[PDB]
Write a structure and sequence with these properties.
Order of helices and strands of chain C: EEHEEEHHHHHHH
Distance between the termini of chain C: 69 Å
Helix content of chain B: 25-40%
Assembly: trimeric
Entry title: Mycobacterium smegmatis Sdh1 complex in the apo form
Number of helices of chain C: 8
Strand content of chain C: 5-15%
CATH topology of the domain at 248-347 in chain B: Flavocytochrome C3, Chain A, domain 1
Number of strands of chain B: 19
Bound molecules: flavin-adenine dinucleotide, the ligand CCCCCCCCCCCCCCCCCC(=O)O[C@@H](COC(=O)CCCCCCCCCCCCCCC)COP(=O)(O)OCCN, iron/sulfur cluster, FE3-S4 cluster, FE2/S2 (inorganic) cluster
Chain A: Succinate dehydrogenase (Membrane anchor subunit)
Keywords: succinate dehydrogenase, electron transport chain, Mycobacterium smegmatis, Sdh1, SQR, oxidoreductase
CATH superfamily of the domain at 248-347 in chain B: Succinate dehydrogenase/fumarate reductase flavoprotein, catalytic domain
Largest sheet of chain B: 5 strands, parallel
PDB class: oxidoreductase
Chains: A mainly alpha, B alpha/beta, C alpha+beta
Largest interface: B-C, 65 and 56 residues
Radius of gyration of chain B: 24 Å
Strand order of the largest sheet of chain B: 7-3-2-11-16
Oligomer: heterotrimer
Structural class of chain B: alpha/beta
């Protein structure tokens, strides 16, 4: 047959000889990705419970609010485009770019190539596909533009940082109070995940031949490499923090109390 | 059989073999490289030391004179002084040209190659890269060979126009014309088919003999070929009684059996030395081995045949993991033995043979033939003891010398010798003999285990004349029982057949070692007698050579006593002071003193 | 606890083979190669193994110990329960020669296709100056005992035979990476790494980094950097 049943290889009539639970990691990856995508696509399109008009909380799923249909006070950069026809999310500016950034990620690519595309489900288990072209043909040659969604992600992280910074306002001046803690932790972890990127590691100093000739970029490359050794952790961590932040803000906008340290 | 006509055949791709291949190729010749294993998987990959080279990168008071003095001191002034001089004054250039082949050593703050300290060396000399130096050397040489044959492809038109690598091919005999090398007969391990290389020059560069001993830190291929090849072809061996042992190195857990235990761990809690560790640490390792064998022969010898060397009732748990990091990680991941909790099982492992084929110093070996030798299979350097790092730059230096000497011999050759068929016939017959019924049969593995047991027990670290001829008498019966060895199966990669073929080399090198160790009646470096404890007699200008009187497959040896050449011309420096030379030399100088 | 193990070794040649059942005494603290050598010494003298040294600094003893590509001289035999069967088979990517020995020649003809190290054509041997931070990146890839487990596990060549001609494998793209990161090399190799040796056939599903005995970060340190370096040359619209 095809790949390990070829006539010249050892005659084992087995898809794999592994005796462990090798199908557990793809299943967990599928469940996590599916849960996140379902939650994000429901919340981004709900169209409500995203803005606390008192303590100025805004969900990352509504980061730049550029419509005149937004809750008065929500737009931090101006209201540009009218009202939208119910199938364009209220954050149509940033959510496409974040989805593209996480889609063309060197880690997420491994995850869903193993899980969805059944390119190797496990390490040494016979692939179900007969022909394979890798990232050489058309639709998958476009994964090399990750380095531009990286710049987009830098800009979106700057927008999120501005929002989290101005979210420190109680009605009677400055404020604190656990919405700020969650928003700030979410932003910091987004920054960490963005700076863990392999394209960041390449653009800062990974493309140099002589490190001794560049003292600053060598330092930056060292730190970014230490961060990048755990790029897999931060992807899931930031998915979880996004979910938790959006959930807490939705609960506070619709109904619960906000646990503040400065008066209202 | 298939026949290949070349200019040089190099039986071995290690350090010496690959350097000789490189040098013979650029002198301009057609070279064949025969390897018992895959390309680049020689025993050199296990070396973890460095290349002793007086490059003067760390401190500039180094020299080739102090390196020569260090090599002569470490060998107890039994070295071939010409080979030691040559290696001392040529080792920097070999290491410097290694890094033009793509090698990446550890660097100093200036960009030069970094050098370590070692025991016998007065100054920092050992050029290293982490703790994988043989791997770097062998990778560099293999990739340089590949570069050379890429150039061959580009200019001549074929990848193998000059160099061809026959890996996984074992050589069994050397065909002779009238005393001159005329070829090399062997077989393919994969197919069991026979190969004949028709070349007028041969560079052996094979390796050690460590598979004749039970406890040893040597590869599968160290079966003693090369030594036996040259011996039963035409040549002589010297200093076969000088085998380097290490009194430690775990013996019981077969996952860690040849893995040497350094003295650093013994710079703490130790085995036993009548006090302070039950400190009498560091007392000469020959006496360490004397105590070990005295406690094993009559005492609480552990079931594995060794002693404890326990470190547990010591720096409790954390100081071990950091003071001995790599040993701890290796043991826990390999033998599942945590050194902070358990006692080791260490014994006298076998590391290196400091004798071998008697080569000429400048150009390589041979009496009549066009035979050449380099590396561990040669003898004369490392007289009675060797220095760490010298064994790894010796490879480069004298592999290049052997390649150059073979090139010149081939270029100055009037008519090429041609092989006879009445010798390829005999080679095929001997190599196919173990495939007969052979009433009252034997087994290759049983005979190998018996040889290993006898050699490790009776010709070990500390020898005795009463028990070193017991082994000499039981080797006779072992070689008599070898006459009935039978292999089961066919020729397609039959490791029983391969072992039955290598047993006839083991049985020759064992007889050489035992017959020399019985005749050298004095202790010096790697050869410890017991009834002759008086170190360093005038058995210094004496070499105790070995040659095959005459016979068939396992041939009887004879050992002779030749003198050495008048020691040194002005190589009696002042670094060599009289107060130091008179401890070793006969009162024969008459010139040295200013 | 010197129990009797239950083994299942693949015996055969290029004509076909089976898994045969054996029973061997396993002493405490010994690797799979020890069990195989015991089997050779007592039961099956003609079993193909291809070992050279017993420390892991080679690449000779590669096999598939229980469905996982591993070195036989390092698999601890304590990883497995005393009551479970251990199934040893040759590498399932390369052609089989005999019982446990495969024909690793594809990755020796792939070796003499990658351009070699070339220094400047004026520099003398004693005059090479490199700083430690410049050689650090390549010194990691130079730790490669050529086990070819990386070449075995890659699904590009393992599951598709027609890609053997187009893909060089993870080992020979790590080679290209470490020649590219050498501070004194001269040839580019970025265009040929993609056009001749098919670097684009690697999806980043690591699967190689998972089997390297030397723990080389093949994908993160060699393959993704080279993919980015090829995107610089071919797919970066900043021109
Ligand atoms: C575990 C260990 C650690 C060591 N560490 C150090 C160290 O730190 N520093 C140091 O200086 N020295 C060290 N040494 C010693 C040093 O490695 C030797 O001087 C050197 O490795 C010898 O290599 P060689 O060039 O003689 O041939 P090797 O590299 O030993 O290989 C010989 C080649 O010949 C081939 N061959 C053998 N027989 C045949 C045959 N019949 N037909 C065809 N081919 C054949 C083999 O396949 C092999 O490829 C160490 C040795 C060992 C065993
Ligand atoms: C937290 C967020 C993380 C993201 C999680 C989301 C989960 C994603 C899961 C879905 C993605 C799974 C992809 C796995 C691989 C499947 C894609 C693929 O393999 O393409 C195949 C399907 O592609 C097609 O054949 C059809 C494509 C034609 C469609 C025409 C329009 C599509 C073009 C899209 C333009 C790009 C838009 C730009 C946005 C960045 C073709 O096979 P191949 O080329 O890879 O060959 C290899 C073996 N033969
Ligand atoms: S890379 Fe790691 S795995 Fe692939 S060969 Fe070199 S060592 Fe073996
Ligand atoms: S296994 Fe093969 S596909 Fe890529 S990351 Fe390793 S190379
Ligand atoms: S985000 Fe993971 S690689 Fe850029
Ligand atoms: S035998 Fe050398 S690596 Fe296992």
């Amino acid at each position: 047959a095809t790949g390990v049943f070829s006539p010249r290889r050892a005659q084992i009539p087995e898809r794999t000889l592994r005796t462990d639970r090798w199908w557990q990691a793809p299943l967990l990856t599928n469940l996590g990705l599916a849960a996140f995508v379902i939650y994000a696509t429901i919340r981004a399109f709900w169209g409500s419970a995203y803005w606390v008009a008192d303590y100025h909380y805004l969900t990352p799923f509504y980061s730049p609010c550029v419509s005149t249909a937004c809750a008065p006070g929500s737009s931090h950069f101006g209201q540009w485009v009218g009202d939208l026809p119910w199938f364009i999310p209220m954050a149509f500016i940033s959510l496409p770019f974040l989805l593209a950034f996480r889609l063309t990620c060197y880690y997420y690519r491994k995850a869903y190539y193993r899980s969805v595309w059944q390119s190797p489900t496990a390490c040494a288990v016979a692939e179900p596909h007969a022909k394979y072209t890798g990232e050489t043909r058309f639709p998958l040659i476009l994964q090399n533009i990750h380095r531009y969604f990286f710049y987009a992600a830098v800009l979106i992280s700057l927008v999120n940082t501005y929002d989290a910074i101005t979210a420190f306002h109680s009605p009677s001046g400055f404020g604190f109070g656990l919405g700020n803690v969650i928003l700030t932790g979410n932003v910091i972890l987004l920054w960490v995940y963005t700076l863990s990127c392999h394209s960041c590691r390449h653009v800062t100093g990974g493309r140099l031949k002589h490190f001794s000739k560049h003292p600053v970029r060598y330092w930056i490359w060292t730190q970014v490499s230490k961060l990048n050794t755990r790029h897999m952790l931060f992807a899931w961590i930031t998915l979880g923090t996004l979910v938790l932040t959006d959930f807490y803000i939705m609960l506070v906008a619709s109904g619960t109390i906000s646990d503040l340290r400065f008066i209202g | 059989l298939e026949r290949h006509s070349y200019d040089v055949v190099v039986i071995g791709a290690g350090g010496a073999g690959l350097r000789a291949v490189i040098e013979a190729r650029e002198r301009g010749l057609r070279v064949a490289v025969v390897t018992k294993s895959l390309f680049g998987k020689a025993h050199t990959v296990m070396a973890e030391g460095g290349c002793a080279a007086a490059m003067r990168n760390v401190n500039t008071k180094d020299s080739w004179q102090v390196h020569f003095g260090d090599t002569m001191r470490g060998g107890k002034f039994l070295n071939n002084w010409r080979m030691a001089e040559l290696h001392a004054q040529e080792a920097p250039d070999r290491v410097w040209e290694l890094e033009t082949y793509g090698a990446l050593f550890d660097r100093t703050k200036d960009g030069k190659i970094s050098q370590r300290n070692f025991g016998g060396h007065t100054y920092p000399r050992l050029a290293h890269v982490g703790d994988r130096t043989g791997l770097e050397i062998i990778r560099t040489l293999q990739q340089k060979i590949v570069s050379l044959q890429q150039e061959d492809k580009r200019e001549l038109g074929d990848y193998e126009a000059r160099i061809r690598v026959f890996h996984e091919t074992s050589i069994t005999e050397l065909i002779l014309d009238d005393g001159k090398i005329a070829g090399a007969f062997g077989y393919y391990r994969e197919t069991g088919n026979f190969v004949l290389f028709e070349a007028p020059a041969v560079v052996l560069a094979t390796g050690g003999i460590g598979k004749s001993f039970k406890v040893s830190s040597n590869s599968w291929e160290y079966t003693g070929d090369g030594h036996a090849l040259a011996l039963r072809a035409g040549s002589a061996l010297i200093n076969m009684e000088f085998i380097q042992f290490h009194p430690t190195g775990m013996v019981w857990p077969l996952s860690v059996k040849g893995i040497l235990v350094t003295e650093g761990v013994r710079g703490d809690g130790g085995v036993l030395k009548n006090s302070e560790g039950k400190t009498p640490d560091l007392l000469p390792r020959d006496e360490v081995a004397r105590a070990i064998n005295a406690e094993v022969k009559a005492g609480r010898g552990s079931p594995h045949g060794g002693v404890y060397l326990d470190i547990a009732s010591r720096m409790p748990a954390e100081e071990i993991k950091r003071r001995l990091p790599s040993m701890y990680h290796q043991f826990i991941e390999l033998a599942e033995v945590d050194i902070t909790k358990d006692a080791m099982e260490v014994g006298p492992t076998c590391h290196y043979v400091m004798g071998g084929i008697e080569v000429d110093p400048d150009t390589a070996a041979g009496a009549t033939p066009g035979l050449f030798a380099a590396g561990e299979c040669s003898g004369g350097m490392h007289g009675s003891n060797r220095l760490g790092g010298n064994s790894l730059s010796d490879l480069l230096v004298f592999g290049r010398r052997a390649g150059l000497g073979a090139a010149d011999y081939v270029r100055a050759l009037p008519d090429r010798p041609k092989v006879s068929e009445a010798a390829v016939e005999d080679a095929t017959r001997l190599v196919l003999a173990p495939f007969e019924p052979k009433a009252e049969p034997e087994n290759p593995y049983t005979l190998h285990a018996e040889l290993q047991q006898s050699m490790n027990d009776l010709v070990g670290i500390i020898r005795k004349e009463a028990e070193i001829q017991e082994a000499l008498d039981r080797l006779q019966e072992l070689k008599r029982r070898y006459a009935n060895v039978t292999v089961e199966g066919g020729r397609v990669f039959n490791p029983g057949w391969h072992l039955a073929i290598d047993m006839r080399n083991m049985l020759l090198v064992s007889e050489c070692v035992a017959k020399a160790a019985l005749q050298r009646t004095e202790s010096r470096g790697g050869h410890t007698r017991d009834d002759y404890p008086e170190m360093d007699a005038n058995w210094r200008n004496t070499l105790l050579v070995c040659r095959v009187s005459g016979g068939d497959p396992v041939v009887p040896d004879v050992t002779v006593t030749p003198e050495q050449q008048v020691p040194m011309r002005p190589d009696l420096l002042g670094c060599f002071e009289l107060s130091e030379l008179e401890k070793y030399y006969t009162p024969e100088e008459l010139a040295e003193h200013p | 606890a010197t129990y009797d193990a239950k083994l299942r070794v693949w015996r055969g040649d290029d004509t076909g083979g089976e898994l045969h059942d054996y029973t061997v005494e396993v002493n405490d603290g010994e690797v799979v190669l020890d069990i195989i050598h015991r089997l050779q010494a007592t039961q099956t003298p003609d079993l193909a193994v291809r070992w050279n040294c017993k420390a892991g600094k080679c690449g000779s003893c590669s096999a598939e110990i229980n469905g996982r590509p591993r070195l036989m001289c390092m698999t601890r035999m304590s990883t497995f329960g005393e009551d479970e069967v251990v199934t040893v088979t040759p590498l399932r990517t390369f052609p089989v020669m005999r019982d446990l020995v495969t024909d690793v020649s594809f990755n020796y003809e792939k070796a003499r296709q990658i351009p070699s190290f070339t220094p400047p054509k004026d520099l003398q041997p004693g005059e090479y100056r490199m700083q430690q931070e410049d050689v650090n990146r390549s010194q990691e890839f130079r730790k490669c005992i050529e086990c070819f487990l990386c070449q075995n596990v890659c699904h590009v060549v393992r599951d598709h035979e027609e890609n053997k001609e187009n893909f060089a494998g993870p080992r020979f793209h790590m080679r290209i990476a470490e020649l590219d990161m050498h501070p004194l090399d001269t040839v580019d190799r970025k265009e040929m790494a993609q056009d001749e040796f098919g670097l684009g056939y690697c999806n980043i599903t690591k699967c190689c980094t998972e089997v390297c005995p030397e723990h080389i970060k093949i994908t993160d340190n060699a393959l993704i950097p080279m993919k980015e370096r090829v995107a610089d040359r071919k797919y970066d619209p900043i021109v």
